[PDB]
């Protein structure tokens, strides 16, 4: 087949000018959509905060209006999903992943309204859920919509605009261009055969998406964490160890999120009303915990700067990790719209911090700043639960700009994904798509 290759090599990277242009517009819409969703999630979290001010004298009334405001929003968003788009529940990444396999529908007229307004319900109530799941589906569907609206035919155009839709949607969720591309190249692309996704296109969409984000968000960063110390070659081994703790814990957590999906189905059966009443109670729990114990509630980003700075007692860190392991599962496994990636950044920061504290006390000759181990553990659960180490490493790199930590970050990531593999664990997105495709047959 040497002659075919001479032919193909000479024809490489000639993406149709139409697919490039349409990737640009997908990028722009996904960016704008991201900002809009972002501004809304906050504005509701504000209204909720200001409510607790107009009634701040009477502490039971306090605990009540906290619970109920989030209960109401939770329900609305569960309902919005159960009623009009049940595949807009949970993450959204397995769905868009499935769609790239040509095995799941891009019901965009149904997901865009349901996912956007459903998330707003669950996110803005202070549930323990992320943006970057929803925005990855919301941006995947936007990518489909402009395929239909302009009726572009071709296999390339369908996988591409779905891919750059999803790419732009993660980039905008974390202000993380390089990390949005890599997610598609490492995790979302079909994993077992060739596919015809144009990478130059995906590049254009993320640029446009990111630039929309910078037009509505500049001067303020998602995680400011300073410049931390360096890492000495004789320190590296401490990170491979930290990795091996994530590699074992990642699959334990995957089990948990699956079984807790199974356990929480037995509570409502499928019954849209026991479901919507169940999310209202979960959401309200968040909205209450959001007041009496905010580290235990919410999306988690807020406390990443604080754990990294080593400003939590060991005692408070251990609390938070358990508590948020609980509220994380309760909120994501229940089926609400919203995701687990960004709260897995929090759980890993909190975990690596606590190791950093141990590792500082045990080795004064190393001159450790427990903050480097927080940065090494931030992308770690992403390497162990969802097995995309290259994305998290570059995700974390982009969000914390501490490139001197690249070797400990890499070394903890291999540790996470080597031990996650070696103790019998599966990519958490892929094990969700499959258990969903297995029900889409039984």
């Amino acid at each position: 087949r040497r002659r075919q290759l001479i032919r193909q090599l000479l024809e490489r990277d000639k993406t149709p000018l139409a697919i490039l242009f349409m990737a640009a517009v997908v990028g722009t819409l996904v960016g704008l959509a991201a900002v809009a969703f972002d501004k809304g999630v906050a504005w509701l979290q504000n209204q909720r905060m200001g409510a607790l001010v107009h009634t701040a004298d009477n502490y039971p009334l306090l605990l009540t209006v906290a619970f109920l405001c989030s209960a109401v929003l939770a329900m609305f968003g569960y309902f919005l999903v159960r009623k009009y788009a049940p595949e807009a529940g949970g993450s959204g990444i397995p769905e868009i992943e499935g769609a790239l396999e040509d095995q799941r529908p891009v019901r965009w007229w149904r997901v865009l309204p349901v996912k956007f307004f459903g998330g707003l319900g669950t996110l803005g109530g202070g549930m323990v859920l992320g943006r970057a799941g929803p925005t990855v589906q919301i941006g995947g569907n936007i990518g489909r919509m402009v395929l239909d609206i302009f009726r572009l035919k071709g296999d390339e155009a369908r996988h591409t605009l779905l891919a750059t839709g999803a790419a732009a949607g993660l980039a905008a969720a974390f202000n993380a261009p390089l990390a949005g591309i890599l997610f598609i190249i490492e995790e979302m692309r079909p994993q077992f055969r060739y596919t015809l996704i144009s990478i130059k296109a995906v590049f254009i969409g993320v640029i446009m998406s990111t630039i929309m984000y910078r037009i509505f968000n500049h001067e303020v960063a998602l995680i400011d964490v300073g410049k931390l110390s360096d890492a000495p070659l004789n320190t590296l081994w401490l990170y491979l160890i930290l990795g091996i703790i994530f590699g074992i814990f990642g699959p334990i957590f995957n089990k948990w999120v699956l079984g807790m999906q199974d356990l929480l189905h037995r509570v409502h059966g499928g019954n849209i009303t026991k479901w919507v009443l169940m999310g209202g109670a979960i959401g309200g729990l968040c909205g209450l915990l959001g007041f009496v114990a905010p580290a235990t509630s919410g999306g988690g980003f807020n406390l990443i700067p604080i754990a990294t700075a080593g400003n939590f007692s060991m005692g408070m860190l251990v609390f938070i990790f358990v508590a948020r392991v609980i509220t994380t599962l309760l909120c994501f496994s229940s089926g609400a719209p919203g995701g687990i990636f960004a709260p897995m950044l929090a759980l890993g920061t909190v975990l690596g911090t606590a190791f950093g504290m141990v590792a500082v006390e045990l080795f004064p000759q190393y001159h450790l700043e427990a903050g480097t181990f927080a940065i090494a553990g931030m992308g770690a659960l992403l390497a162990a639960s969802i097995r995309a180490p290259l994305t998290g490493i570059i995700l974390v790199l982009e969000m914390t700009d501490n490139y001197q930590l690249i070797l400990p970050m890499i070394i903890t990531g291999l540790g996470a994904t080597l031990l996650a593999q070696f103790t019998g664990g599966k990519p958490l997105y892929s094990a969700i798509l499959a258990r969903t495709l297995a029900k889409q047959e039984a």
Partner: antibody
Amino acid sequence: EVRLLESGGGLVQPGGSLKLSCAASGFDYSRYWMSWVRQAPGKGLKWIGEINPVSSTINYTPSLKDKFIISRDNAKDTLYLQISKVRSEDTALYYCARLYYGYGYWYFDVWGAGTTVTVSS
Amino acid sequence: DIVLTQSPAIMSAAPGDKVTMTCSASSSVSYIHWYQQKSGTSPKRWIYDTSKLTSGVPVRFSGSGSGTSYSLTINTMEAEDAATYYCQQWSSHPQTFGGGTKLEILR
């Protein structure tokens, strides 16, 4: 040029206290660890303690609760060592050092000329 | 803590002549460092990580060792090589120096 200039030594009466001062110039004095080493007349080198750039971890040699007070003022680009209840054992040349590493085993990178502290009534 | 004991407390050697002092550790030690002190001069880092010279340290200087015994060496000693050489360990904590070795010219 990288210059470490410690000052503040001299004659002090037994049981008193003094505050030595090392002024850094020629490098980002933040981001470096600083340390104190002293040399008793015709004797060995001896480590007093170290302070990390943010002042969140301060080590001292195995010695007495408030005997030494290392601290730093990154705005002033200056490091300080306080000696209290001054004995004759404390009569020594006091050296101010900046800390680094190689393969990660930490060494005493740049020293200053010294200041001498004499403890006599 | 770890006691380091430098061995020839004092010694002399003619210029262009082989010098070899010694460090020794009460417990086990990794990657020792070496400082060159002239009287009235700030102690200078001479040799670090058991073997790496420093910017300026002429090549006649070389250090060696493992585990519990280390050593400095000047293949051809000079006049300007007259000084005191202290070894120092931070392989454990806290870090300790040795007593010294005074290297004096011979004439």
